[PDB]
């Protein structure tokens, strides 16, 4: 608007799209990013309750645009007369940019947005910076997960460090796929395509990461307090038992689903122990968890134990006195899912007025590029 | 007078000022608001933001605002500015599950009791529009299960699993004004232990605490089937009665002399406390099981205008039934 109170910020993901206005602590709307065609186009929430009678397609993968003919139809649904009702000609937008994205894709979304939509202001922001802007910090380490891949990225004052960014190729999709394989060995057959969103509710409702594996197995072998009954839309009742704490442990032991690596706990260690010595303490104290695939119960309480044990037998071998002076702390507020949005809700509020943050429309009328 | 809402248990219940609407939580991650259209209860609204079991609700009447807390380490403040309720965010900084929530008499702070050996007193800040918390943690060794507020908007009673009942002060200088002198004490900084009780040898977990209308008397129930009343006017003195029934899960003052209790026996009871320092059992109030409630009663509240003049009281519990009891 004239005073600037029509800035809209949206987080685009592979599984869920979260759009809202600045100055609010909550997303205005969340919806899954499904577009499909029957066997005209059913886009958005309608592609969730019915998908056995519909062919689906996911138009993104870790920020990489799979098809440049479906994102337009999704963005029309977002910026259309069913969710946000915006007058598109008078608005400014703040978008996310995942770590390590290629140049052509970065300047293709900026190119297509000024042309077929006629906004008035565009900015693209790195998610690692936004996650810490919502926490009050400026230097830290972001361990973000979701449905793509799990990134671990440090950040110094305002600017990320792409040289020291690491990635692990397991996320919520691999865990919910592994749960199908585990449930297959009980007499319960769920096909890969049409029942993907039925086992996802089972994963969301009944799964947790164990603190001590030993007591978990003792309770699983000599006690029946882990088995729970889940009702299905058809009316059947299935029973899920010891499979609750086996599916989430592909993260800490990645070889169980044929992925070569070191796991999230050890990859974090290998990332913190690869920078200059002076700033290593600045990263130990401030580790922030973000994303929807870090809301399992116990995942906060396991990484602390793993890092303390990995730092007491690799760096300070033996001599268990100085660990008390060594302070390690992990921050994980109960608002982990939308921390990309909330950061975007702050950065658009502070810098709403001064007209250098945004990329002006007139800049691409003459130059066609940007340096900010 | 019994009414059966749902077959599932009721975790917690809240009333409003006119006793027209009721907020319930049917053992799930949702809150249901019901109103009364004539002579039948019909559901009105649903509130759903938690992703965990909801454990406590309360309704500030004069401001008309609902505070909700649950086991997902979250708390929300629901307000009605349009036809649809909307939430507001609360920063609590706890790492274990919350267990109890309660508003203050002046409706400017609220106290949350949690399982991290903490008590969180939260107050409002408008420069960026959320609630910010302060912690009381010094003498507590275990999880808190009950809370109550003094009429003078400073002192705070607490019961915990470490077999102690404590009285703290929660004076926040940014919001509150300076208090007067009470029999409980004189010097009242924030987070300072004012009094402590719980020495009886075979002490059990304290499930419920409550203050009187005068503010100079405290009462609490324990899991060893005992009720106790502590007086502070004549002197810091206690009187404990050892009942021969199952444990009691809630307590509330009706007047300066009588106290009403409920628990797993499914039947509310009335005790009398004389001015000389003696507790005496009086009677039950409900003279399949031979009792209207079919399971343990979890919460006791007052239908009338509270401790100044109380006539009727409400009971709810695990059976799914809600009952109104009248003394007359």
């Amino acid at each position: 608007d004239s005073q600037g109170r029509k800035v809209v910020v949206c987080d685009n993901g592979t599984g869920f799209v979260k759009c809202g206005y600045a100055g609010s602590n909550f997303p205005e709307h969340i919806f899954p990013a499904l577009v499909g065609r029957p066997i005209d186009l059913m886009v958005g929430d309608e592609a969730s309750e019915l998908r056995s009678m519909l062919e689906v397609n996911y138009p993104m993968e870790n920020g990489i645009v799979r098809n440049w003919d479906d994102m337009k139809h999704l963005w029309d649904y977002t910026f259309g007369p069913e969710k946000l009702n915006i007058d598109t000609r008078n608005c400014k937008i703040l978008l996310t940019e995942p770590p390590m994205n290629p140049t052509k894709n970065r300047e293709k979304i900026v190119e297509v947005m000024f042309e077929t939509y006629q906004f008035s202001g565009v900015y693209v922001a790195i998610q690692a910076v936004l996650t810490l802007y919502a926490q009050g910090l400026l230097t830290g380490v972001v361990v973000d997960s979701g449905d793509g891949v799990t990134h671990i990225c440090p950040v110094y004052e305002g600017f990320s460090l792409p040289h020291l960014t690491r990635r692990l190729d397991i996320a919520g999709r691999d865990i919910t796929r592994y749960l199908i394989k585990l449930l297959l060995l009980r007499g319960y057959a769920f096909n890969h395509s049409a029942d993907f969103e039925t086992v996802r509710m089972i994963k969301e409702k009944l799964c947790y990461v164990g603190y001590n594996i030993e007591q978990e197995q003792k309770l699983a072998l000599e006690t029946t307090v882990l088995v729970e009954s889940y009702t299905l839309p058809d009316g059947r009742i299935i029973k899920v038992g010891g499979e609750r704490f086996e599916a989430p442990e592909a993260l800490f032991q990645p070889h169980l689903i044929n992925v070569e690596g070191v796991g999230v706990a050890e990859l974090l260690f290998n990332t913190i122990q690869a920078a200059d010595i002076d700033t290593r303490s600045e990263f130990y104290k401030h580790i922030v968890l973000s994303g929807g695939s870090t809301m399992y119960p116990g995942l906060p309480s396991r990484l602390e134990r793993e890092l303390k044990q990995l730092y007491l037998e690799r760096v300070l071998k033996g001599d268990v006195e100085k660990l008390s002076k060594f302070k390690i702390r992990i921050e994980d507020p109960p608002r982990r899912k939308h921390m990309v949005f909330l950061g975007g809700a702050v950065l658009a509020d502070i810098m709403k007025d001064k007209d250098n943050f945004w990329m002006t429309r007139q800049e691409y009328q003459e130059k066609g590029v940007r340096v900010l | 007078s019994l009414h059966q809402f749902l077959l599932e248990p009721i975790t917690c219940h809240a009333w409003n000022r006119d006793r027209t609407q009721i907020a319930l939580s049917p053992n799930n991650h949702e809150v249901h608001i019901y109103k009364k259209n004539g002579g039948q209860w019909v559901k009105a609204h649903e509130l759903k933001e938690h992703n965990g079991h909801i454990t406590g609700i309360d309704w500030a009447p004069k401001s008309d605002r609902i505070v909700t807390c649950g086991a997902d380490r979250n708390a929300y403040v629901w307000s009605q500015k349009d036809g649809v309720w909307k939430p507001t965010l609360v920063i609590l900084r706890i790492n274990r599950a919350a267990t109890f929530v309660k508003w203050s008499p002046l409706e400017n702070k609220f106290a949350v009791g949690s399982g991290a050996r903490l008590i969180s007193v939260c107050y409002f800040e408008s420069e960026n529009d959320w609630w910010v918390s302060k912690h009381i943690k010094k003498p507590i060794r275990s999880t808190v299960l009950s809370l109550d507020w003094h009429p003078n908007n400073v002192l705070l009673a607490a019961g915990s699993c470490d077999f102690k009942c404590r009285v703290f002060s929660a004076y926040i200088k940014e919001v509150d004004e300076k208090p007067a002198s009470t029999p409980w004490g004189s010097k009242m900084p924030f987070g300072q232990l004012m009094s402590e009780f719980g020495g009886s040898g075979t002490g059990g977990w304290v499930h419920g605490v409550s203050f009187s209308a005068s503010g100079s008397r405290l009462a609490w129930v324990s899991h060893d089937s005992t009720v106790s009343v502590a007086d502070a006017s004549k002197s810091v003195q206690v009187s404990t009665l050892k009942t021969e029934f199952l444990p009691l899960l809630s307590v509330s003052f009706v007047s300066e002399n009588s106290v009403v209790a409920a628990g797993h026996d499914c039947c509310p009871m009335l005790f009398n406390y004389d001015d000389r320092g003696c507790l005496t059992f009086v009677s039950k109030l409900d003279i399949a099981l031979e009792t209207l409630h079919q399971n343990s009663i979890t919460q006791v509240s007052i239908y009338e205008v509270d401790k100044q003049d109380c006539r009727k009281f409400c009971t709810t519990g695990i059976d799914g039934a809600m009952t109104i009891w009248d003394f007359k």
């Binding site: 600017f159 340096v371 | 960026n128």
Partner: peptide
């Protein structure tokens, strides 16, 4: 050898308040 950033210094931005506002958030959250 290299600075803390582990990159060449960006002279364009060197040639050319958020921190004030972020302190209240840092106080309230932590």
């Amino acid at each position: 050898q290299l600075p803390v950033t582990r990159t060449k210094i960006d002279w364009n931005k060197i040639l050319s308040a958020l921190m004030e506002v972020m302190q209240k958030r840092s106080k309230a959250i932590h």
